[PDB]
């Protein structure tokens, strides 16, 4: 029995949690009650299997059971069987589910709901997150859950809860979105580029983090970590959680051989231990390390070793270059590794290989300076405009690049892209690139998966599928879509009402930003000069109309003077 197996390993509390997340991630539209019911029904059945490991259908695989339980409340997917049936659901997960924005009642109500029924109050949190983020890294979601419980348990019994809770919840909201983003990239890689791509990223990233570890050790870690994520992303949540625990034990047992910063981590609860390890800082770089050129460019055995085991050889190249360059982004290292390989492929077919591949590091110089200059420039620009204006500059740039993309998606993506300025520019040159470019990777991955749902821009498709590691330079190289046909104005699109006034300070900018997007789609060729000059106007429309007697019509009157002056510029 597979169900009994995992039940013992995870226990009842986690098992029930993981199954709920799984159901919430497959059927995101179904209500909380229905999942709660199915979970229990499933959970009890599991209990009968622990005892009689051959009772009803305890022999069946997880998918079969999970599939049959969901198929009692859904249709074509359920018509299929075992493999095809499961893949069916996986292809139907919605990255942008049409769910009602989530608003949180007053502090008083929450605490009451939490104190009254604790188990319910948390199952709903899980439920509401899992259905909105169908790819959220399950094991890590149980971590946020406990952290969420700790929030209420502490803040509901204080002087001013509003002051104690609201903040901690905001910190959880953001970090949860960050987490969801990083994981979405990991699944995309596995699913759209194959495990080989994922492994390389893991080699380089892990080699940067565990510099003292041996290639064979990293290789072992990478292999396991790969299976973990391969399972989570494919919906095998139980086994993913299982395998992720094992990996944590292993890393802790073998600390000394891996890293010296894993101490603090291994001295705490499971969920905290896993989370800790996955975010540990890079270990100090080993003192006396030979020069790379030695075994990789000067040696005369290059081509031969390359021939014998291309995979291990290139893997070793990556590990060696990555370990001594924590100042490089994972994508740069991988670009370097691709340059190296391409060079051996052509050079090892020449008369005198050595001569041909003797100056490979001169090919590296350009690749290393591009990111640096890009980052140096844009942070200077950021330092000058602030986050709001920078986001605007980004909205103008990205809409001109890929005008077909939906306004909701461009707004979302550009705002996030702007946050990279705030998150990374503060760091010194040394840690700027990892920060900047790996973050850009995450954010452009969102653009790519949202877009894939309804493709409308071949330029996006090409930049998203051509190469995982070159996505950023691909997009950065785009200027303005010269074949794009300007849109024709729509009264409704530029009609600002008083309902703006009730909206938060942010929900406003978001409105003004959405208008800037629409404007640029109408006037691609427009200039950053005119754009500004028009934005400030909109600012005026808001302050007036919003504070001028009983006027829900000023929105039509003040808005008329708006579009009028708008159609002029």
CA–CA separation, 350 and 352 (whole Å) = 6
Q: Do 285 and 326 contact (CB within 8 A), yes or no?
A: yes
Closest CA to 200 of 296, 320, 312, 334: 334
**C-beta neighbour count of 510 within 10 angstroms:** 15
Closest CA to 43 of 8, 70, 14, 16: 16
Closest CA to 470 of 344, 311, 332, 325: 332
Q: Do 331 and 367 contact (CB within 8 A), yes or no?
A: no
Q: Do 356 and 302 contact (CB within 8 A), yes or no?
A: no
CA–CA separation, 198 and 176 (whole Å) = 22
DSSP for 140-193, written as a single string? HHHHHHHHHHHHHHHHTTSS-HHHHHHHHHHHHHHHHHHHHHHHHHHHHIIIII
Is 242 annotated as contributing to ligand binding?
yes
Residues 255/259/264/270 CA torsion (nearest 10 deg): -50
Is 236 annotated as contributing to ligand binding?
yes
CA–CA separation, 445 and 440 (whole Å) = 8
Residues 411/414/416/422 CA torsion (nearest 10 deg): -130
Closest CA to 409 of 462, 448, 461: 448
CA–CA separation, 372 and 174 (whole Å) = 28
Is 35 annotated as contributing to ligand binding?
no
Closest CA to 39 of 64, 56, 17, 71: 17
φ/ψ of 367, rounded to 5, equals -60, -30
Extract the tokens encoding 308.
């014998």
Percentages of the chain per state (helix, strand, coil), in multiples of 5 = 75, 0, 25
Residues 371/375/378/384 CA torsion (nearest 10 deg): -170
Q: Do 211 and 323 contact (CB within 8 A), yes or no?
A: yes
Buried b (16+ CB within 10 A) or exposed e, 132-141: bbbbbbbbbb
DSSP for 289-324, written as a single string? ---HHIIIII-S-HHHHHHHTHHHHHHHHHHHHHHT
CA–CA separation, 105 and 54 (whole Å) = 47
C-alpha separations of 5 from 18, 70, 365 in Å: 15, 21, 53
* 445 Cβ contact list (under 8 Å, min separation 6): 181, 184, 185, 188, 471
* 201 Cβ contact list (under 8 Å, min separation 6): 189, 330, 334
CA–CA separation, 314 and 320 (whole Å) = 10
Q: Do 333 and 469 contact (CB within 8 A), yes or no?
A: no
CA–CA separation, 261 and 209 (whole Å) = 10
Buried b (16+ CB within 10 A) or exposed e, 315-354: bbbbbbbbbbbbebbbbbbbbbbbebbebbeebbeeeebe
Closest CA to 173 of 221, 220, 125, 135: 125
DSSP for 526-568, written as a single string? --HHHHHHHHHHHHHHHHHHHTSSS-SSHHHHHHHHHHHHHHH
What are the chain's domains? 1-94 (1.10.246.10), 95-184 (1.10.246.10), 192-283 (1.10.246.10), 284-369 (1.10.246.10), 370-481 (1.10.246.10), 482-559 (1.10.246.10)
DSSP SS3 for 456: coil
Extract the tokens encoding 120.
């319910």
For every residue of 207-257, which 3-state class applies, written as one string?
HHHCCCCCHHHHHHHHHHHHHHHHHHHCCCHHHHHHHHHHHHHHHHHCHHH
DSSP SS3 for 19: helix
**C-beta neighbour count of 167 within 10 angstroms:** 12
DSSP letter at 29 equals S
Residue for token digits 């599991």?
Answer: 46
Is 63 annotated as contributing to ligand binding?
yes
Question: Which residues in the chain are immediately followed by a break of C to N over 2.5 Å?
Answer: 74
Residues 209/214/216/219 CA torsion (nearest 10 deg): 10
DSSP letter at 491 equals G
C-alpha separations of 416 from 387, 462, 477, 512 in Å: 10, 22, 19, 16
CA–CA separation, 364 and 366 (whole Å) = 6
Method: X-ray
Is 9 annotated as contributing to ligand binding?
yes
**C-beta neighbour count of 35 within 10 angstroms:** 26
Q: Do 383 and 425 contact (CB within 8 A), yes or no?
A: yes
Resolution, given in Å to one decimal, reads 2.5
Is 13 annotated as contributing to ligand binding?
no
CA–CA separation, 15 and 3 (whole Å) = 10
CA–CA separation, 479 and 180 (whole Å) = 30
Q: Do 62 and 2 contact (CB within 8 A), yes or no?
A: yes
**Phi-psi category of 549—alpha, beta or left, where left has phi over 0 and alpha has psi -120 to 50?**
left
**C-beta neighbour count of 549 within 10 angstroms:** 5
Q: Do 527 and 520 contact (CB within 8 A), yes or no?
A: no
Closest CA to 470 of 289, 334, 284: 334
Residue 124, Cβ density class (10 Å: 0-12 exposed, 13-18 middle, ≥19 buried): middle
Residue for token digits 């290789």?
Answer: 219
């Amino acid at each position: 029995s597979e169900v009994a197996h995992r039940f013992k390993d995870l226990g009842e509390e986690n098992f029930k949690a993981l199954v709920l997340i799984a159901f919430a991630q497959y059927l995101q539209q179904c209500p909380f009650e229905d999942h709660v019911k199915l979970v229990n029904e499933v959970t009890e059945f599991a209990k009968t299997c622990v005892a009689d490991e051959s009772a009803e259908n305890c022999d069946k695989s997880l998918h079969t059971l999970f599939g049959d339980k969901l198929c009692t409340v859904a249709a074509d997917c359920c018509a299929k069987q075992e493999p095809e049936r499961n893949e069916c659901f996986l292809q139907h997960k919605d990255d942008n589910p049409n769910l009602p924005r989530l608003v949180r009642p007053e502090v008083d109500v929450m605490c009451t709901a939490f104190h009254d029924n604790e188990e319910t109050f948390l199952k709903k949190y899980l439920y509401e997150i899992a259905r909105r983020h169908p790819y959220f890294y399950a094991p890590e979601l149980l971590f946020f859950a406990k952290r969420y419980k700790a929030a209420f348990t502490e803040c509901c019994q204080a002087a001013d809860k509003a002051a104690c809770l609201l903040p901690k919840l905001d910190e959880l909201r953001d970090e949860g979105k960050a987490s969801s983003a990083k994981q979405r990239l990991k699944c995309a890689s596995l699913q759209k580029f194959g495990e080989r791509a994922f492994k390389a990223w893991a080699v380089a990233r892990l080699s940067q983090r565990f510099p003292k570890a041996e290639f064979a050790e990293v290789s072992k870690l990478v292999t396991d970590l790969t299976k973990v994520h391969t399972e989570c992303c494919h919906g095998d949540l139980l086994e993913c959680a299982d395998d992720r625990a094992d990996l944590a034990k292993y890393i802790c047992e073998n600390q000394d051989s891996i890293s010296s910063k894993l101490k603090e981590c291994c001295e705490k609860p499971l969920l905290e231990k896993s989370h800790c390890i996955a975010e540990v800082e890079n270990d100090e770089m080993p003192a006396d390390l030979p020069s790379l050129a030695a075994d990789f460019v000067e040696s005369k055995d290059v081509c031969k070793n390359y021939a014998e085991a291309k995979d291990v050889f290139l893997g070793m190249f990556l590990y060696e270059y990555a370990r001594r360059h924590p100042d490089y982004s994972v994508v740069l290292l991988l670009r370097l590794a691709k340059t190296y390989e391409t060079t051996l492929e052509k050079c090892c077919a020449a008369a005198d290989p050595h001569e041909c591949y003797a100056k490979v590091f001169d090919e590296f110089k350009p690749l290393v300076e591009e990111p640096q200059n890009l980052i140096k420039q844009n942070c200077e620009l950021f330092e000058q405009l602030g986050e709001y204006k920078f986001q605007n500059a980004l909205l103008v740039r990205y809409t001109k690049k890929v005008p077909q993309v939906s306004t909701p998606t461009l707004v979302e993506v550009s705002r996030n892209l702007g946050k990279v300025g705030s998150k990374c520019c503060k760091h010194p040159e040394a840690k700027r690139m990892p920060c900047a470019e790996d973050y850009l990777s995450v954010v452009l991955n969102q653009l790519c998966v949202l877009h894939e749902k309804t493709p409308v821009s071949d330029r996006v498709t090409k930049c998203c599928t051509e190469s995982l590691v070159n996505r950023r330079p691909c997009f950065s190289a785009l200027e303005v879509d010269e074949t794009y046909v300007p849109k024709e104005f729509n009264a409704e699109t530029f009609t600002f009402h008083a309902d703006i006034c009730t909206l938060s300070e942010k929900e406003r900018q978001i409105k003004k930003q959405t208008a800037l997007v629409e404007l640029v789609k109408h006037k691609p060729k427009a200039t950053k000069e005119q754009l500004k000059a028009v934005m400030d106007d909109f600012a005026a429309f808001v302050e007036k109309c919003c504070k001028a007697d009983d006027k829900e019509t000023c929105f039509a009157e003040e808005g008329k003077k708006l579009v009028a002056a708008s159609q002029a510029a």
